[PDB]
Write a protein that binds this ligand. Sequence first.
Ligand SMILES: NC(=O)c1ccc[n+]([C@@H]2O[C@H](COP(=O)([O-])OP(=O)(O)OC[C@H]3O[C@@H](n4cnc5c(N)ncnc54)[C@H](O)[C@@H]3O)[C@@H](O)[C@H]2O)c1
Ligand SMILES: Nc1ncnc2c1ncn2[C@@H]1C[C@H](CO)[C@@H](O)[C@H]1O
Lengths: 495, 495, 493, 494
Amino acid sequence: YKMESRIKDISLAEFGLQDMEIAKTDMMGLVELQRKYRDSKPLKGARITGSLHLTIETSVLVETLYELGAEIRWCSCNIYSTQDHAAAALVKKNIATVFAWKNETIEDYWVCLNDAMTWRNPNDKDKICGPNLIVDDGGDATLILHEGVKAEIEYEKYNKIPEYLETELDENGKQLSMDLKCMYKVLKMELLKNPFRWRGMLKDLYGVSEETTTGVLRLKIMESEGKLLLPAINVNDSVTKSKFDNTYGCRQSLLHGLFNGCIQMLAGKKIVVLGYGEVGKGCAQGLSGVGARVIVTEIDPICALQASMEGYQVSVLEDVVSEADIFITATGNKDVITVEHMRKMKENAYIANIGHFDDEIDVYGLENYPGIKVIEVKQNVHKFTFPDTQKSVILLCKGRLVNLGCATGHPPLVMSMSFTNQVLAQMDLWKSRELVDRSKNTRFFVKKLSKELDEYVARLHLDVLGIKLTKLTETQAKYINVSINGPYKSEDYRY
Amino acid sequence: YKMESRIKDISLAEFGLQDMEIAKTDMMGLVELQRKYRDSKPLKGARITGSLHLTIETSVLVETLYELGAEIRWCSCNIYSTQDHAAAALVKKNIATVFAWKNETIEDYWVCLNDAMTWRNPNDKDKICGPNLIVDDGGDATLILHEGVKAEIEYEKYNKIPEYLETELDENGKQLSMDLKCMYKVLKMELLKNPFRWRGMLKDLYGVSEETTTGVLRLKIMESEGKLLLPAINVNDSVTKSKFDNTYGCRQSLLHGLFNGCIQMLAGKKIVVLGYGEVGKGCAQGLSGVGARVIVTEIDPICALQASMEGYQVSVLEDVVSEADIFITATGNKDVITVEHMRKMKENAYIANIGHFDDEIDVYGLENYPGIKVIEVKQNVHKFTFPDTQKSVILLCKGRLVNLGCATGHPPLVMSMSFTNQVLAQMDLWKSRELVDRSKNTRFFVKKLSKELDEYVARLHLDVLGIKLTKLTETQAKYINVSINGPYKSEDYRY
Amino acid sequence: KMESRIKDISLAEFGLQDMEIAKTDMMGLVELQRKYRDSKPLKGARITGSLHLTIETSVLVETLYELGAEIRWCSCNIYSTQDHAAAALVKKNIATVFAWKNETIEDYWVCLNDAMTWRNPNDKDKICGPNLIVDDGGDATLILHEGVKAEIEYEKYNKIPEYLETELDENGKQLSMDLKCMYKVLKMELLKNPFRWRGMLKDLYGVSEETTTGVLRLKIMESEGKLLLPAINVNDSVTKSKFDNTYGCRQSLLHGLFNGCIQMLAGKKIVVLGYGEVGKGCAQGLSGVGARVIVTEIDPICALQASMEGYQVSVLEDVVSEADIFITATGNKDVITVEHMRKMKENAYIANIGHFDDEIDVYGLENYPGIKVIEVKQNVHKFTFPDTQKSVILLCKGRLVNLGCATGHPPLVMSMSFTNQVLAQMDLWKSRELVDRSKTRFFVKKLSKELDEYVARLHLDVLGIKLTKLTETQAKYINVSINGPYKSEDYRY
Amino acid sequence: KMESRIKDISLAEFGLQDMEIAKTDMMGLVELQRKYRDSKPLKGARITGSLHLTIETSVLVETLYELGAEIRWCSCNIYSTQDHAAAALVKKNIATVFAWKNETIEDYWVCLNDAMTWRNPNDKDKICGPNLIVDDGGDATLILHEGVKAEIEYEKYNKIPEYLETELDENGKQLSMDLKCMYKVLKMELLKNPFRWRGMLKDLYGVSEETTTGVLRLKIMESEGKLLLPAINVNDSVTKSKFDNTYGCRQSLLHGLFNGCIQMLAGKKIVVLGYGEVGKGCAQGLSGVGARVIVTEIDPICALQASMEGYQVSVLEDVVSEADIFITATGNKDVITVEHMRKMKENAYIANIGHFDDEIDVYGLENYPGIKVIEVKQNVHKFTFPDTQKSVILLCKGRLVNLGCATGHPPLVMSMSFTNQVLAQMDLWKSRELVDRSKNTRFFVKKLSKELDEYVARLHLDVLGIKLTKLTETQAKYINVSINGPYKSEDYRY
Ligand SMILES: NC(=O)c1ccc[n+]([C@@H]2O[C@H](COP(=O)([O-])OP(=O)(O)OC[C@H]3O[C@@H](n4cnc5c(N)ncnc54)[C@H](O)[C@@H]3O)[C@@H](O)[C@H]2O)c1
Ligand SMILES: Nc1ncnc2c1ncn2[C@@H]1C[C@H](CO)[C@@H](O)[C@H]1O
């Protein structure tokens, strides 16, 4: 009787269970949903698949979904972010089937995702079937689904494996990213097992809730091109998520990540924060809090002025690359820090990325620079030395998100706010499942939760911090044209 | 009070003219618009009436509108905000016809507004006509126009002066505010002169651009009930206005206000910021900057958490009113500090308002409290002593916006940003005047400026602060799905 | 009243009202008045004061008055006097005042001289001096020493000394107007009575110095063996230097910048020259409103401290063309020269917060050939160079900006500084029998840590502070008394 | 004896690589090696060190070694050792080490005693002592003095003193575990040789103390006339106290809390007890990440300073129930008692950043009748009272949290503190001839000059790209100083 979950160690379960209980002290949003909905079980019968950093905080999310009645299969959306003790808790209590561990190979990542997406047909002659709902962080669960369908249609056309899957090259001629090569390797394997797999999932698939900015961007592109195959909810852009998680969460988790990976003192150092959006604002605020001299880079004139108003210098990377001490990428873009920028940096300069993917820093070009010399400084920290100048740079966790790679990500309070939106999004998608009609080619769309619910998430966490909310009088409520119980701001308010 | 300005002292012109030139160093947005459009003159022929705090920064606005071809008549939107040397400058160099001075009585304020609205067309027998466009701040120019129209329709329904314009009481038997009585006093006088005055203005009236949150509130109410009789542009909600003027403007001008009117040290004091919106955030940020212990009051749970995340205590006024030292209202609401709260305050507590109207603090109840003792500490600073406790509270400029009442308001940089949106809004309203056809549509809506123009306002002020903007490469532009030249964010982005 | 020279006596009512409001936070002075107004430990003492006559200073004068002293006062700067504060004192016959806002440099020295002059009680109509001096900057102390030096040189040759009658100095450089007018007053007094200043030594028992610059002048006199009276360094009390110098300026520099400079401080590059106690406060306040502070320093320890607070530390010559605003806080000379001013960007603002105007080369700027000056507003001037046609805006002619363009530090910190002043005066007065002028060099000393802690205790209730009390076991473990002192003499706080 | 006692020698390679990376910011120690490795001013000196064996400490040890010293070392806390750092020293034969993370209190004093034990081979293998001591907290100095004191008492009545063979103190109260284990070692040494400690005095030339608590101990001995060797107070150097104690903690406290405490610090009411040099840095760090800092103080001067930074100042009793996290930074005892802990809210965190664990009543907590304890993770324990069922979470049994749950201060500030240490060691060695034992003379505690203090700041300016301005002839004369310093009077507080 072997277990189907693949994790590091099951005996670490008890530590994970005690950390979940401690975290729950601050996660009053998820604690309230469990208290309120565990009897009625609003998600009963739902098969949920999650692709999201399996941390302690996430384990409480999965438990919340379980207590509400869903069967769950889960994996991580990054090779370095899983907390093995959190994973073990879920498996020990039989809360969810898990395919996740810390320090996975890229190939392991894609097999764990595919397995998480695979469901056995219960009492209907066991064969392949998919999930009903998806919890996604970065869009990888959503991508494999879409790329699977695309690969299957292309397969029937010529009745053979599509040429783009087998090849290692791309449209241009350069080497494909390891992430793509492994994803294609898995799709090719599934075409040989069963070429109707991905399209078979669509009939019982009712929606996906996306957690982060980069995943939402991917979802919006598909929506405008009319290629979105399931309804979706943008959890990232809820006020109680983007204004707290992205900003305040990072203020603390970036520092935790830098302290663990970088041995140096952040005070007095020139630290460049590339991108001054919701994540960058938080990164800059924490770095200043500990004495760093932050220097910002931006493409957006509005964001540039905001950094300027907070006392920060705004330069282009090329003018400070030789004097700066530390570089933190928070743009969600690609090739922000190139091999050529890295060759100009000072001795032992530190490079980190807090964006979702490792495309911001050119890690592939760094690792494959002719005659590069690399050494492990500690777990998930590497020093690269160029052969011509003999100068080095220290990269934190191969360009993957530093707060989750070298630390544990955001703390429970802000995660409960993000995850309360997730549960509320999952319920909305599940309760609406009847409107999803697969007959007429009705395009699928991306929507946000109501402001009513967004304020509700905030109300659920006021007691954690001993916040005493003032209440409006009928006259006051009428004077500012709002209901005593809200909402209190118009739909375009920016907080 | 016809075509000859009415100011305090013309001899102050040279000081006003030199401060304008110094201010222009940072008001690059307005400087660029003058350089760009003074030849073509897009506003040529427009009669503009402005109701906005007549400061040095506003003079540059009026100059800009004048250089673009407009004829202008201006007044202030507050009895204490006018800067007499700024008003003289406009009159001396003959840029506009001004009706404003510092420390006006409420009676004269409404006369000044009514005078700025009155024009004499020299082509059609020198008859009384109205303005083509209105620059409003607080919605008073818009209010007198709409109330005037309702007064004329009510005047013809019975062929007599309506009862509400003569009585000093409202529907509940309470005394009407001096501002309503003084406005009704003007409307009555205009019904006797010409009962078709306000309805006559509407024919040539093509728009209004509103500056502040409180004015937009009034516009939204009218709009939703189909009572807005002219097109409107909401300048307040432009990113380059709301997130800079409201927040960073107050961060500096609140302190200037308190330093001039309040003699005590702010460091270590418990200062209560009521409302943690865009103005409140800036207030708290400035106060903390000089060592104060800020305590926040809120009705909005999201804003309450935002305050909490910045390390601020969030309480209801009743729990801290006895121990707190200073009180700052920034809600844009009414009855936030009642007489009963003022009686519980400690000896020499200071009270100030930074919202647009004096309604936040019950100033009328305090001044008319039986046996109240009142003395002038300095110009626009009064100490009120209650007879039963012998305790005193010190009120800054009778509850009117303290930054403009006790000091000179926000500095030129953010006002240039706020005023670059104003000029662009006037040009929009004027260029699209042909689309206003009253034989078809008499009810209008409020719109905001595009994000293209919003980002443009920001480009114009980058060089002021030595800001270096990064430029996206084609690959980066394509990867994040935006144009190299912008816009760089989606319409729902909150910056 | 009769003697006094002030602007307007009608402003007295507003001054008295401000004093009462200020007293809410100045619990130190209020307490000293409550406790010592009956016994009057300073009764019969004649006290002369040279210190920025502000509302806060009027409460100090009122306190010294309630404790029994007879007072004559003047300001230590030509722009810092608050006319309503000086009126309040005259109207209540608390002191004979010689001070007004916007004095000429010449009148400044005539006021100080008048403050130092006292008619001999009811004995006759002969002139004598003060028993005690309250000084800020060292000018009251300087005129006494230069007056004695001038009288000795007078009797040695039986004529006026040549150095008092010349307008050029050592290397043919024009003398500062402050020396010009001081020597002018000294020459006038040698003609009326060549024993005036030396006669004041007989009854002069001490001086209490308020600021860092004045203290430097005292220690130089002490080390050269030329100090003619005992002195107390009030500036170096923990309750003065750690609060007045730092947190005082954090608020009052901003007040002054907001009144003189119309521009927004957010995002601007503001150079703070000197990162001492005043510099630290300046930087903290500037950052609080979004400025990007750049620091200059000579001390590598203070430079590293600046670096730890996230500030860029540079030499002025590398940032003078790009910086927007300049704040000198070194207490040194020629920190900003005319050459530096010519490299500055159009409409760059320059200001000083140190005690004297010497930090900026104002005289060189005003006298630059072809220079064109215009008055922007009260005590704010725009200077324009003839060759480049570029301009710089100087605040209140290089004199201390917080008191020049605004009203100085708030009451709370001044109370801490002035409670130390009153305590210094009481000390000097109680030891007047030990001053024997017929044997002895005088020394500069400081108040004890006990009195330093006492000053702090007197201001805790203002801010609602709840102090913890050590148990006997804890007091023994950390080796202190329950009632203090809690730190060693070398503790830096 | 002769060989080291450490966790794992294979960790040495990681230790050496972290040392090399740390040297980028420790230009004080790098400059001292460059300058003095050839002349070797410490040549022949035997040095025993009791100081947290971290990577930063390993560079200190390496510096003393490059200057010609023979070294024996141990940690000054049971949880502060970094095993890779300890192993790096043993691999290069830089020193003989007795230290590892998670020592039992017994093993602590045994290691310290071993580090003090020198095998002089020029006398056919016979025991002697060190020439110089580098100390942090005063334990090396404590075992020396108490050792001497025990031998004098032993020799008086010719038997083992009864105060060493007992669980009780002067008033029948149980002795701290550290005293019993120290005494257990002192008794052992009386049995082997009752002249051991007094024999060390002959060649012992001095001690350089790192921290505030150890300095307090030294000053008490000085005033009572019981100090047995010259001492140099390194804590009170300006380049130590104003940087290490304040800015070091600003970062290392947050690192410790982040590793030990899973919760978000933003919006929480965090109580910082003591607003001294350490308290100031802690509060500054906590505010930086959005916490609401509440301060407790006994000193009204320090209380007003807190108030000037916008912090509420309260007595612990009025906030113990509502506060979320408690950080002791007083250097005192019984600042947080069992009775305070019983009133705290569910899952309140408690930590100490003072040198010793006495600030929190840990012994009382662990021995409370019916208390239930569980290990949450490495060095983090949750205690649950049986009557209320409420729990408190203690970080690393009340020991300095920055070094116990994290890796202490970063290299830059430690280089400043340790550059002072080396200079203090060189001073004590240079002046060894002035120590005349054959007289019974009083020994004093002295501080390094302001000249060498400014010198330490100069050696680190380049690390952060600081361009220092230089005084002109006229300016120097105006402020009455030399162009090359010192620039401040001795009483200046920075
Ligand atoms: N963890 C580290 O890395 C580190 C670094 C430096 C110093 N330290 C240690 O931290 C402790 C404090 O060092 P310091 O330099 O701040 O000393 P300090 O004297 O500057 O600060 C201690 C403060 O605590 C206050 N205090 C004493 N008892 C109190 C009580 N019962 N309640 C409230 N306040 C009280 C005192 O008034 C004093 O201001 C020392 O034990 C020192 O060894 C630790
Ligand atoms: N990384 C570190 N390595 C070694 N020593 C450290 C470290 N961080 C802090 N310290 C010292 C600990 C001591 C309190 O006992 C303080 O005086 C600090 O100097």
